[PDB]
Design a protein around this ligand. Structure first.
Ligand SMILES: Nc1nc2c(ncn2[C@@H]2O[C@H](COP(=O)(O)CP(=O)(O)OP(=O)(O)O)[C@@H](O)[C@H]2O)c(=O)[nH]1
Ligand SMILES: Nc1nc2c(ncn2[C@@H]2O[C@H](COP(=O)(O)CP(=O)(O)OP(=O)(O)O)[C@@H](O)[C@H]2O)c(=O)[nH]1
Ligand SMILES: Nc1nc2c(ncn2[C@@H]2O[C@H](COP(=O)(O)OP(=O)(O)OP(=O)(O)O)[C@@H](O)[C@H]2O)c(=O)[nH]1
Ligand SMILES: Nc1nc2c(ncn2[C@@H]2O[C@H](COP(=O)(O)OP(=O)(O)OP(=O)(O)O)[C@@H](O)[C@H]2O)c(=O)[nH]1
Lengths: 427, 426, 427, 426
């Protein structure tokens, strides 16, 4: 079992330096780069007593790359993998895909192929990016189209950071997301979304951290994406590989946007006072405010969800928990897939970063759940997009790059084509 | 003389089979390395029916372990008796099935069947005369359900007269550890109902219920559940492993239990079942076991036998006991509860006894019953199959592997037929 | 009983230093050269308390000879037997046969005759070479023509390494084999072929050695040619001499190319877990992938095969094995020779090299089986040869040596003359 | 046994050859003075193939250094291993060529050829049996281009059967360090294509591009470039210098790589190539080197191999390694990329291995390839030749030395023919 990761844009490298911070701590790998089969899916054996990561951090702006090259994890990452551009995308899907993308995709694609040649058990890929940025929206759309025509059959996990309803970092981020989703729809097998404001109230309420940064955020997101691949690393009573999440979550080829939520998220002083068990965590993840995406689940119906656990958790009490959750009438499962449960257990417990706000817990759980609760978000993104598209605002840059109103018009009706079938299956 | 070859398809098949060699090796007195340290000379006669003699007084089993993921082979190899298995039988692919019946049966499994078909040719030639194949798989998932039922069809083409005994564990409504259970179950039973002449339907709901009422286990893991099902697999194949006053071959139960060729889905069970905190307060006599034998909550199936009628049942006792009180007990259960037995058969009970019980116990038995209560299990999974199939949900991945929706409709035609077969004789 | 061996080319010396490694260990001969009738057929009595081998390692390139002279088996081999040339053949049948061969064959032929004079029971010869090389194709063709006119009646065993279907060390090796086979057809009594890629999957699958070298290969091939002559060394219940393989394998004077296969080939840790017996080895050798030549036996029919065993093997169970193999309909023997079985037993068991990957076994078996399964190889070698012959590529070197298109045309039609009678007898 | 005489014509020839004795002397363990201090006895056998033994356990090379300016001889004499060379081989005139092919080939060089021809008579007689001549020159300029190719014709008249190997570096369009490059190149290749049986076409652009991508050298001088090309000259002549499992003579590559007498322009290359800042983060295994072996930006020629098709290639590995995984790797490059190989040959790959690697490294290899991509280099220089020749620019100096414009037209007839030869087999 092997899988190659790729991080794009400002959002990717903050996920890169954080998510790889705990992997080397999980396998007992010191930061210098050295200390039997669990680390094979993310670290190769470089001759004798040295490792190297299976990742590519591409970014147009080198302001993040030189920081990592001059950071503390210098001896770990390959200097060739830290790819550098020439100039930033400027929150332009057109500039990050067509002008700046084409003159560097020939180097990035050849770099991906030569690393994939020596692989033998390459299960798939996982992409880290954000449609609200320029490099994460433009350059990621280029490689996904160019590698899908090459490989195609292999799986892909798109970990994209989406915009919030009222919170927003930029103004052109609807234009970045509306264009790239037209290309990401047909080639991305499954994309797990993340919201920026959804993390804000989580740490404020549960972790009671009133001045964190991205380093606290990405440490949690890095732990979330470590649990989904934890079955392949360490042994488990009921293991699941990378192809398991492609079938039991994507019933239709275009409806491939599951929500995500994670629990328990308890502070240090609060962990000793709170009783850790299977019942409260199994109820906490289905709680609507405890999600990584601010979308009302009660406005729709759930299609299917997977209950992947960690640590010494017996398989019986988890079956009783999902059985009790089925009886709760506060939620409502759709009649098209009522038995949409997928239990999973792993023996290796959750790790802990030294000095981090997250506390040690003997058991944890991660959730990916397909539902019709995302259609209200796309409806909101279309309405706010119509305000700017009507006035033709922030359009002279894209056509100044080379685009035109045609693909902008095709991108608008594509969401309308996505609005109808989410409401149809929601019946 | 009457050898048996063990096959272990799927993740559950490797784990359920690893415990089967665990328990029978104890009563036979086999070392973890492979040597013999038994206490009685009677254990040495019929060792060839499951093991092969080797140099240095070493013995090796005929276990055909097959799976599509290498994790199960490494874990079983590091088990208590992982080293006794021969390494060449551990054939395995690289990519798992991902709970897809189409991959492990047409595309992903076909790359592996050519490697295992030549291995069973070697093991089938080493024995004097094979009696029947003891396969173990699970309807849940794609590996054991897809690739396990494939070689059932291929081996039956080679041996159109030998016995094909399978210990198939099925899904259940409340215990649903996988979303693709009805589709994998519906396609597998289309082949198992036609090819295999014997089938032992096991349900995980009963395995959780059986350990609550009588064992009182507060943290029962998978290892605790495997001890129950492994003892039933050992109890049925005990008469042709030790001598007794009335020895019943595996085929002699098939002739008595299978009045029609498709009607072969049996109800497994086991006795005695007592916790450590109440072992002294229970009587080990035959009247105590027989009442607990046909109890409504004793078998390894969730369906209530009170909602059906037994067409035929068997109680292969095991251990030194008087068979006079045995026959009086089997006479009382059919006479006192005659409403729960078919009137168009005079005697629905089979008998068999053995002299040498397992280690630690004095008298025991194993239950095998073909009843009409199992139709409630086949119809509820069909309702789960019918609910999702009518919208063609979770089928586009099957069509990618060269499948078609017509075979799903044909599988439904076999599903609704066999449940009506039970309704006829009810 | 005596027999003289000769090794030619790079292929011969790696077989020489390996095959003679176990003979001196079989007879208890230390590497220094010293310790009653078993060793007489390969080792002479050098006065008192010293031996000398009955072999000639001829080679045009001295890069291998000085290694053997500076090797560990210095005191064993006679210094005159290690013949050296002046310059390599350069993968040229013409240069190794005509220019460089004629100025040294006068010394080699006189050296062979003076050693053969003191013999009294010289049964025949056995040649180790490879048509894919220059020295093994050019120089071996010279001596075989020149000694056959002299002796003629004596037998010859050509142990030639052939090219694989897709694997190949050089590009001119079809030109080396197509020319030398025109001369080897009429003078060679019987030639047992070996394929290079056929050994690769054997050790990979059975011996599970994932980085061996030629030293592991030639140790197996040296053991194979030790078992075929083992009846003459040690006593046996049913002995067979060198002339036995001339009659029961060569039904026609031109069809003299039997296949070869050997079993059991089991590792150390795998030997204890697997039961060694007569049944599985008799089935294992007839398995098509268990052969030393990658050619499908099902595409033709078997003419005759010999079952020569080793170790304490009773004569009854071997008769039951071949009787059961006759009943298996997966194979099909030709109607022209149904009773093509030749059983043979030897008391002396297989030896074991210290540190070698091969494990100790109480019984073994070697096979030489004539069949029509080789005609697809000659058909393949003719088709690939026609691709280069059409463009007249790699021809200017041979005519630059002195050759011309005439003998090249006679060599092409000779295989066509060989294709027709293989298909004729296959009916 | 199979001796080689090194010739060094032109300014580049003396410098490129000085580094050749630098690197091979290290692995052989030769003192800067001339003595031997090696660690292994295997280094002492085949020292005669490039050096001559002398008294006091001293050794001297057979380097025929020739040039028309005394500056290159004084600098090489003051080098790291400048004192080891014998002074009598340092023959040299007074006046330079001034980048004129006609002066160093007809008038100025003819005064010097009589002095050097008698020297090779002495060195050719001292050896047991010469194998082939390893010359080094550059098409740029007049000294190495004019006088270097002159003695090619004279030696071939004496030895019409021996091997004449040359490591010729050619000009390039972007890197043009001399105005008379196409005229000097066009007249030189007229003789090299007919006389020499082997030719290694090296381009200075690739030597700059190879040091940018993988070595990451921020200030690479001529000494850094010489280390790359000198290792390829050492790698080709390693099998007949140390023993191995499959030793390939210099002539054995000629028979395999030269399907026609003129078609002998080879593509040199080298591996491993990794910087000091990334040497630790790389695997030295055979699958890692083989992918980098046939990389589009690895060879020492600016022409893209993707624009052509390999007619034949060689990879003489060097170091202890398993040849099993080697053959699978050479099988994959020709099978996975079969479009970039000619269909009218079944196998385009040659193999060879050695046991003793160089100092500091464990496994290595060297590439030699004859492909159709080289025709893009011969045609662009022909356009440079045709652009200036059509106006007879910079030809009056050639006519002063007794030349004629007809020979320039005849050289063009050889130039446009050989590029069409590659077009035939493409
Ligand atoms: N009675 C038992 N049932 C088991 C055991 N292990 C698993 N199972 C049940 O069988 C169900 C599916 O069987 P498996 O665990 O073998 C899934 P499989 O290995 O075939 O596919 P992958 O692991 O995804 O490669 C599973 O959900 C359980 O309900 C066991 O040890 N004993
Ligand atoms: N690969 C290398 N190329 C070199 C080296 N030195 C020079 N050159 C290249 O060869 C080109 C011409 O070769 P030379 O330097 O020998 C000029 P030459 O000495 O023959 O004439 P004069 O110096 O004018 O007497 C030159 O322009 C370079 O492109 C070197 O050390 N290595
Ligand atoms: N949640 C989260 N989002 C991030 C993080 N870093 C960047 N982002 C996302 O990045 C978006 C801003 O655009 P950037 O990704 O920074 O674009 P860029 O890489 O600076 O390049 P340009 O778009 O050309 O300016 C925001 O909308 C964020 O959602 C992070 O650490 N955490
Ligand atoms: N199987 C096996 N084949 C070998 C071995 N040594 C050499 N060969 C064969 O030799 C062939 C290569 O040509 P060589 O026989 O080495 O030719 P050479 O002796 O080096 O002399 P030239 O042909 O002039 O280069 C390959 O095709 C191999 O099949 C060996 O140890 N084992």
């Amino acid at each position: 079992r092997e899988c190659i990761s790729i991080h794009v844009g400002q959002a990717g490298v903050q996920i890169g330096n954080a998510c790889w911070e705990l992997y080397c701590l999980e396998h007992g790998i010191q930061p210098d780069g050295q200390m039997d089969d669990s680390f094979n899916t993310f670290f190769s054996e470089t001759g004798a007593g040295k490792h190297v990561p299976r990742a590519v951090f591409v970014d147009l702006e080198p302001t993040v790359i030189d920081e990592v090259r001059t950071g503390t994890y210098r001896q770990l990452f390959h200097p060739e993998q830290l790819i550098t551009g020439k100039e930033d995308a400027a929150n332009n899907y057109a500039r990050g895909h067509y002008t700046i993308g084409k003159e560097i995709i020939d180097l990035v694609l050849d770099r991906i192929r030569k690393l994939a040649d020596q692989c033998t058990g390459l299960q798939g890929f996982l992409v880290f990016h954000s449609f609200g940025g320029g490099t994460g929206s433009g350059f990621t759309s280029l490689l996904m189209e160019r590698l899908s025509v090459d490989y195609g059959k292999k799986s892909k996990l798109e970990f994209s950071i989406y915009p919030a309803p009222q919170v927003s970092t930029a103004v052109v981020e609807p234009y970045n997301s509306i264009l790239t989703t037209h290309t990401t729809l047909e080639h991305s097998d499954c994309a797990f979304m993340v919201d920026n404001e959804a993390i804000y109230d989580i740490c404020r309420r549960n972790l009671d951290i009133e001045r964190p940064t991205y380093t606290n955020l990405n440490r949690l997101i890095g732990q979330i994406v470590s649990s989904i691949t934890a079955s392949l690393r360490f042994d488990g009573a009921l293991n699941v590989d990378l192809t398991e999440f492609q079938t039991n979550l994507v019933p239709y080829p275009r409806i491939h946007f599951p929500l995500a939520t994670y629990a328990p998220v308890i502070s240090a002083e609060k962990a000793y006072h709170e009783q850790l068990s299977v019942a409260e965590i199994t109820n906490a993840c289905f709680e609507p405010a405890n999600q990584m995406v601010k979308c009302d689940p009660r406005h729709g119906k759930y299609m299917a969800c997977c209950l992947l656990y960690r640590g010494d958790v017996v398989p019986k009490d988890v079956n009783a928990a999902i059985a009790t959750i089925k009886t709760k009438r506060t939620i409502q499962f759709v009649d098209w897939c009522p038995t949409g449960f997928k239990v999973g257990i792993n023996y290796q417990p959750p790790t802990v970063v030294p000095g981090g706000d997250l506390a040690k817990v003997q058991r944890a759980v991660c959730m990916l759940s397909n539902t019709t609760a995302i259609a209200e978000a796309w409806a909101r993104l279309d309405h706010k997009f119509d305000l700017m598209y009507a006035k033709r605002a922030f359009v002279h840059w894209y056509v100044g790059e080379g685009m035109e109103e045609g693909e902008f018009s095709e991108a608008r009706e594509d969401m309308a084509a996505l609005e109808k079938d989410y409401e149809e299956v929601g019946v | 003389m009457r050898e048996i070859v063990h096959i272990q398809a799927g993740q559950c098949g490797n784990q359920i089979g690893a415990k089967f060699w665990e328990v029978i090796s104890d009563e036979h007195g086999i070392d973890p390395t492979g040597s013999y340290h038994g206490d009685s000379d009677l254990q040495l006669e019929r060792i060839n029916v499951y093991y092969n003699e080797a140099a240095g007084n070493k013995y090796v089993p005929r276990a055909i372990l097959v799976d599509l993921e290498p994790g199960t082979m490494d874990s079983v190899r590091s088990g208590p008796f992982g080293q006794i298995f021969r390494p060449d039988n551990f054939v395995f692919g690289q990519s798992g099935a991902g709970n897809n019946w189409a991959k492990g049966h047409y595309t992903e499994g076909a790359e592996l069947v050519d490697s295992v078909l030549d291995v069973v040719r070697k093991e089938s030639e080493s024995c004097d005369c094979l009696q029947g194949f003891q396969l173990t798989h699970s309807l849940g998932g794609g590996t054991g359900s897809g690739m396990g039922t494939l070689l059932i069809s291929k081996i039956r083409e080679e041996y159109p007269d030998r016995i094909m005994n399978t210990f198939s564990v099925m899904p259940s409504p409340k215990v649903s550890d996988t979303v693709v259970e009805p589709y994998n179950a519906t396609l597998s039973v289309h082949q198992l109902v036609e090819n295999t002449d014997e089938t032992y339907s096991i349900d995980n709901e009963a395995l959780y219920d059986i350990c609550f009422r009588t064992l009182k286990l507060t943290t029962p893991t998978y290892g605790d559940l495997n001890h129950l099902v492994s003892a039933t697999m050992s109890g049925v194949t005990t008469c042709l492993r030790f001598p007794g006053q009335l020895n019943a071959d595996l085929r002699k139960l098939a002739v008595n239990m299978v009045p029609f060729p498709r009607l072969h889905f049996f109800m497994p069970g086991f006795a005695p079942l007592t916790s450590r905190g109440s072992q002294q307060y229970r009587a080990l006599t035959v009247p105590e076991l027989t009442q607990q034998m046909f109890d409504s909550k004793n078998m390894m199936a969730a369906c209530d036998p009170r909602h059906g009628r037994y067409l035929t049942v068997a109680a292969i006792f095991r251990g030194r006991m008087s068979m006079k009180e045995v026959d009086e007990q089997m006479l009382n259960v059919q006479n006192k509860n005659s409403s729960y037995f078919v009137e168009w058969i005079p005697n629905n009970v089979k008998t068999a006894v053995c002299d040498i019980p397992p280690r630690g116990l004095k008298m025991s038995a194993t239950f095998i019953g073909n009843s009409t209560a199992i139709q409630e299990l086949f119809k509820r999974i069909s309702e789960q199959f019918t609910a999702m199939f009518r919208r063609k949900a979770f089928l586009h991945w099957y069509t990618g592997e060269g499948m078609d929706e017509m075979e799903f409709t044909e599988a439904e035609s076999n599903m609704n037929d066999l449940v009506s077969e039970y309704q006829q004789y009810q």
